[model samples]
Target chain A: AEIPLFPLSNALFPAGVLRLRVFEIRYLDMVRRCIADGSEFGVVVLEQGTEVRRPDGREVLARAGTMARIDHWEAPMPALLELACTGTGRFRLHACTQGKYGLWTGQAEPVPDDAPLEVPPELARSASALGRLIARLQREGVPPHIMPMAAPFRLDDCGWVADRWAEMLSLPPADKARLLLLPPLDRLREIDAVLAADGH
Target chain B: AEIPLFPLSNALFPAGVLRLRVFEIRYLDMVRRCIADGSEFGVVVLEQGTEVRRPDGREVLARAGTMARIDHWEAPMPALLELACTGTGRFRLHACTQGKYGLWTGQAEPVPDDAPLEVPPELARSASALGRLIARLQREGVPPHIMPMAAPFRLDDCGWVADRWAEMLSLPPADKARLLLLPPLDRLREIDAVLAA
Candidate 1:
């Protein structure tokens, strides 16, 4: 499938929510068209380049990316769009091209979702930590819809729990990108190791 | 000692080179003072906050940072200073505070340099790759002064080689920060594991 690419400095995992402030004409138009068509775009971490467009800007995109669908949007000002997007699935870009108005489009294939695996007893602490975090955020008056993790929280599932922790952790984009490509169990193990290393 | 802090989105390893476009009044003044006194400032990765200051900006700094000295400076435009800096030593911040004009100041102690450890035979590939990269950069007409890794390269030293590779790698600031706190041999081993992984 051909999907528009929004290269960013950070990685977005499946079920993670991202708030984007769109001001560029290329992205503005891309958002409008996607909303009108009820479509999605790919969010890929940039290996090199600035998010904002510049005449001398050069972009090198990672091959792996997550597909995102806009769940909410508001126009705060003219030429500015405030968008709340939810990640959907992973995709691997086969080839990419600069299209109309400097928008990047890629020939990509969707990667299969991780098979649901329960959080083993040894790794249950991660899930419990996530629960405490959610409760804390709620106590702090963070609205549910705007939370980094989407609703129908799967605290029991290894992949789901790992992804939420991965998003919350300050791991580098490269590390997160690597986590995104790992299997659900392996991903959870990686997060568990990080938690252990930090003395959690 | 209390030193001024420059928070950025990236990490600067020991012996790494960083170029800064100083436009903010706080940093502009900071750079001028550092140059005048021949002193160094701390470069810490920002766990939070934008590099460019804003009225509502909040900053959270990593505990580990590198001390950097201005090696070269040029003012191409009014109120803008272009600076080339070289990382000197690692420091661990004991406490940080936002001081005059929103410039961050920290009470920090210098972290000991990694003990001199020769690159093990097993890890010679990393050093070789770095050497080839330097050659390639030179062939591409990249000036030695502007090279990411400084000259008089210590390719035989495990810590120095690891730091050069860490700077070139696209690892996230958080990972780089973790690397900054590790010992030289362990740092090289961690980097090697990353290479192996």
Candidate 2:
């Protein structure tokens, strides 16, 4: 089961939200159809659609990625879409193609994210100090938001904390890209080196 | 000037409160000196040193980090120090041929963090939504104290809101690390993405 596409940066799982801006006419057309039919499109990481074209010169689709459903829309000029998506639901490429409006599409299969976490306990225990340090920084008022992620933060929360911390710390696009590749649960140990470098 | 040396990765800044458990003879001497010298030792980020060490073992100082001062100490066997310090300036190290401790005594220059920002219009406005999000997250049993500073939140009262938001959103530590590197202003955009992501 597959369809045409409107790609964004990286994948968005079901109950996930993606932000987009609609500039051209064909995408506006795509948006209208998706809205009318209650269907959605896909958004993968790399800038998509550097290949073949669609009928109206508005085709851009990168097949080797995930699928999405547009759940919310706030179109000011280049519209914004909040995508509800599912990731790793594999799909076969019926045809690789792109649209005229800087977008891309291809047919895909459905994959589920029920896989277990790849995190270890030593790393989780090691990270416990960051949680406490966050509390200390909060007490001083430099920033307390980190403290709330107290001890016993699960591996999932640890990855979220690590990913969010990297962005806040601005660990560089390559680092962020590395994080994007990690499973959501084991992301903490990777970013901790950056934290240690900064003396977090 | 320069300090004796202590750059722990546990996030202790000047004008910050730091607590350390002391036992090593050199550090004990250092502590005794702090007790005698009014508890002011230059603090810098160390280059190499395990959390567990025998005595001033392998410590290569950053030479370009903050300075910290001690405030108080209490203990029966292993002296604990309660330090209240200010990062007075930055320092450097020409050589590491040291005394009993991993000594890094050199010149220190002063610096301030007057950094720029990457806040687009959409990113700035997102702060308002972030503010409301904080209040909502707080109500969700997200302990009150840390609700601020968790993000470069778009409200008054600067708290660690991003850390808390990471919790509320159930984001991972890898994501949290991203937020810490951001220069206070650009985080709103990240917030928008997190909320949207």
Candidate 3:
């Protein structure tokens, strides 16, 4: 089955929330169609390519990606749309085609979601800290994506815990792509080592 | 005297309306303060530097700029601010300082506004097209900046007339930079040939 592809520079992890301000005419059409038809779209990290349309049609995308489900959107003005979507499980790109508006539409196969893995005793601190931050945001009546009810916060699973934090942290896009596509157990081990080294 | 500077990649001309959706914390505070004090801020085209905060810390701003006055602003959400500003006459940069958030504030001298020159007969189409566009947008009840009252939209001055069209057109930033700074006669001649083409 084929779907639309929105290639961005940032890697989107499973269950990650991406806030996007769509203004381009092509994307505007894409979003409207997605919302109206109740369809999902793939978001891939751009290995090479300009996000904005240019005289040069340059774009190279990674194989690893995720399906995005639009949660909410608002149009402050007629021309601009602000929306937020949560990332689903990982996916591997099969093919893509660009339209007149520089938007990419494509087909992809979903990668299995990570199985639940208990947070290790030593690595519990990182998971707990993220939990605490989520708790505080809820307490402060902070905006969406932070509250307990808003997102599926999986603090118990090491892979799940790591991905949420990884998306937020400032890291190289390539590193993020690697982490996003790693196997579950290996992903946890890497995340644990990262946490331990940071004195977590 | 130090004037606050908002350097952008887009060229802003005298009597032009620049629509900005300001989200950065420093610029957010800048907008709020300017409104409170009833003061204007300097807006320069980025000869060098990013519109965003770059880790490399490399940015060189152009000397020629315009003074922008906030005409209308709205907050659809708490963090994001949507605003429209009308550009006044050109200005020359004197000195600039970066704030903690990498926002540039500076001292600047205002350049005299261009004298009003009626649109030459050959260039009437450009003026008429702009006027018609403005009227059509108003009829559709489109948002501000597109609306006639939102900007000065000086159709009289050839420079003012040409600059507005140039800003709206999707031309290279360099060409826009040059066209914006050109004198009335040169700017009009350039715009006249463009209209002809």
Candidate 4:
């Protein structure tokens, strides 16, 4: 339920595994605590001041983020924590007390418990492609848990994917935070821009 | 130029900033390498066994992937690397080959370094919507540098944005890899799936 917070510009979904290295003083402490507890730490989309705006122009603020729990940790010092996370859903802040390591205890709007997403043409195509890609990755010896969480393998709602995709697009932090405040459908369109831009 | 590999399940793009905690030996090596080398590492989409998989499923492999370099480190332990990466540029298997360390050596293909993407109405409509979202993200105070590349923004290439959207969708690592490998036009369809799904 609770763990250390590692802010990133991108989104971290549940069933997703991200790699990291422990080197910082505070974070090292966090890792020690997590390891000591036999528990996972948290991987969150960093809010702001992360880095200069990149080509996509996306960033993160405190709002457009969620927490990820450490699921697996790879060996030795400066280890990578494989965080097992299910996007519990969207999060928002009324205020941050910022006591220790920036605590954010806020309300969460659970991502709708997914039913099967309506398979559209492109999505279905991707589904098919995903099937093949997964097979190929299998040959290559890549893990399956790292695959997409949607249909073809994992089925999820479109709006959920759309909103999350939209959130994941390279919108600036303020923009992502604003999106975190958006209604579902609107966010879908936003995500569409990213795909539309790519002609996918 | 190396950060320990975690063999992630999804894709991590260039100019993207995210958090991480190192705990594995290989990946811990990556972190030390990243720290030593200024935080540059490959972010290949783990082919399989990244998160949750059955014994057989866990053994499934992923082929398509890319190289990455970190742009930032926010934390000391479990340092957050702001990754800057690109698609299928040539890389050497021997370059950063640490099987599962997420390390590889390669040159990136130049991105949409051309004119603004031209768009038709259907594409424009979707793009316009996507554009609004981009504007909205900016308003929310996201870090500008952490965004994806700018070439797509200059043009109306739904192909580019859509593919990126597919990546953003984070359906699964394999799905994201498909988006990465998809012919530009094919990838566009995947984007629509996200929109329509």
Candidate 5:
């Protein structure tokens, strides 16, 4: 089955969260539909064109995308809605068409969730730091997204840990798209290298 | 001289830009004074207390801070204003006292700016990537504070380049503070090694 597409300028990796403030008429309607239908949307990183509508077919969206399920929503003020959605799985875009209000709709083939990889003994420090960071944010009254798991935190898994790190780093959208295509071990290695560079 | 302080949870490094939405009465008054006097304010990463009023003396602010000068202000709606401010230099807080309106007043000792360090041979890739990213964002019409810079991007200075990268990254406030203290060469080496790794 195909899901609605929301082309964005930033890449959203599986297990990552996308927080946005929606004020545009089109996106507000889209959020309403998703909540009512219990449906999800696909997020693709835009290569060309602005976040607003471009009728000239000038926008180039990436082929690799992520499926996002709305985990929380709050109407903080009039005519404004704050959304927090969690990435579910990777997807491959089959095709995309834009609507009158500039909303892009597309068909996506759901990509399989990566195999859970054990945290290499050497990378245990990263897992621990990430855990502490999350706990600290929550303690400080910052509602940073937790792992959203019913069970214990998945810090033991390399993919789960690495994706979160990559999400935090400020990389170009293109680089982010490429990183998402990499396997779990490769992604972990890439993140390990970045953290090492940052003196993690 | 004393400067009004806007204590925040996040660290703002020198030469960095912070965009804020103002609604609190104290900050509104503070912003008005800065605008009228054409003065800068100090931005200190709050070690404790909320952005809103916390009457208790529980708030602990970091001594190291950045002096911020307002660049733009917009009244987009009723009783709300948006601001864009750029960091000028680092400051060390000497004392802080709160007023009846929950505003913070402080005395700060200005810190010297770091010497510029040239981008060493190995870190050329980072310079190119950063330059391209900035140019691309500009072309796409993203706001400047997000990357409001002009070429030839400061790729030559090690301190300038590394600070930009560190500011872009979403590290913990403590980690950010440590990065600002290292010498230009030391900080560049650290940034280069990270880019290399």
Candidate 6:
């Protein structure tokens, strides 16, 4: 299916919150149309160039990206639109074309959901830490929609735990994009190694 | 009435929006209680002090300040609370006392609302610029609650126009506090001079 692509500096993980301050006319119109039509947009990490377009600018986008659905939005002032979006699923950009106003629309294929694998005992600490973080936020009265991770949180699932950690950690954008492309078990193993090396 | 004081570096003009990210435990509890009790808080510009308290920190607050009412709040993380507040009215702090957890509660007197004086033709340019700004924001679909200036916009009132410009312009906190203390017509004249020279 065709989806509008929003190239950003950071990677967005599934179920993670993506708050954006969109000022460009092209993206503002895109957000308006998406909200009106109840359609999803693709959030790809920019491989080259800036998020804001310049007359002499060029952009290269990552093939692996996430599907975002706007849950809340507000325009605080003219030329600025604030959006609270959630990453719904992953996708691979098969092909894309730039529109008249520099908005990129892509022909994409949906990636399969991560398999539900149990968190191994050796990697249980990471899962437990995430659990505590969520518990503290819940106790503090953070609303479900505003929480970084959407609920029925699958803390017990290896892939779910890995994705949450990946979202929180300070990894390079390229590394995050690579992780996005990996299978669930492999991704979990990679995260496990990083956790062990960091003495967490 | 007694109001809790939150001193910051920036001044909040009446009817202006003040978005804050409160992370300290003292303030988090304060905000939570304020929301529960449906009470307002005083936002004072710090005359001399840091916002975050340190072991040896000393704070001196401005006597003139604005009352803020929380319009919306959210806790995105455990230690942080995001608040969308609006300045409600002006006040002069009579006296203040520090609390157990570094929170300050003050005795204050409410200042009267600005008078309804027509925007004279000579000062009409400032009002027109402000009107254009609001119109552009409205056309771009900016929500009323999020707008810096609240609705029932008194664009014709001299004091209202002056206050709005004071909120938007690059002015020192001291200058803003002085403006807040002045009567409406005098404040408008001060702003008119600013616009002219």
DockQ for every prediction shown = 0.04, 0.02, 0.02, 0.22, 0.15, 0.02
Ten-residue stretch with the least lDDT total in model 2 chain B:
B143-152
Model 1 per-residue lDDT tens digits across residues A62-155:
7788999898887744666778898998988778999887888999999999889998988876777677666544554443433456777798
Off by over 4 Å in 3: A145-149, A198-200, B1-197
Tens-digit lDDT track of model 1 for B1-197:
78889997667888888877664565777888899989999999776655555455577787789999899887643434668898989998889999777789999889887777888877775666566555544554543433456777798898898888677543545567777888778778876655433
Model 4 interface RMSD, one decimal = 8.6
* Per-residue lDDT over B99-192 for candidate 6, one digit per residue giving the tens place of the 0 to 100 score: 7888898998999877689977777766765676666456645434335567768888887878887765434455677788788778887866
Docking class of 4: incorrect
lDDT of 3 by residue, A1-200 (tens): 57888877567887777777776677889988999989878888766554543444556777778888898877755666777788876787777788667778777778888678888776765676567656644554433422212367777887887787566443344456777888755676664554332221
Clashes of each: 0, 90, 1, 116, 3, 0
Residue B168's lDDT within candidate 5 is 60
- Give the higher-DockQ candidate: 1 or 5: 5
Q: Estimate the Cα RMSD of every predicted model relative to the unseen true structure.
A: 9.3, 23.9, 20.7, 8.2, 6.3, 20.5
Docking class of 5: incorrect
Candidate models: Cα lDDT each: 0.75, 0.42, 0.67, 0.46, 0.68, 0.73
Candidate 5 lDDT for residue A77: 54
Q: What TM-score, over all chains together, does every model reach?
A: 0.52, 0.34, 0.50, 0.54, 0.66, 0.50
lDDT of 3 at B33: 92
Regions of model 1 farther than 4 Å from truth: A198-200, B1-197
lDDT of 3 by residue, B76-156 (tens): 434446677888768766777877767788777666777778877776666765665554445544434223234455766
**Compared with the true structure, what per-residue lDDT tens digits does model 4 show for residues A88-164?**
44444333332354432333333433344454555543334334434444554433344334223442344454543
Candidate 4, position B62, lDDT: 40
lDDT of 2: 0.42
TM-score of chain A for the candidates in order shown: 0.91, 0.51, 0.85, 0.58, 0.81, 0.88
lDDT of 5 by residue, B1-197 (tens): 48789987666777776776664666887888888888888888765555444344456676667888888776644445678787888877788887777778888888889877677777665566566555545555643333334334576787777777767654445455567766777776675555443
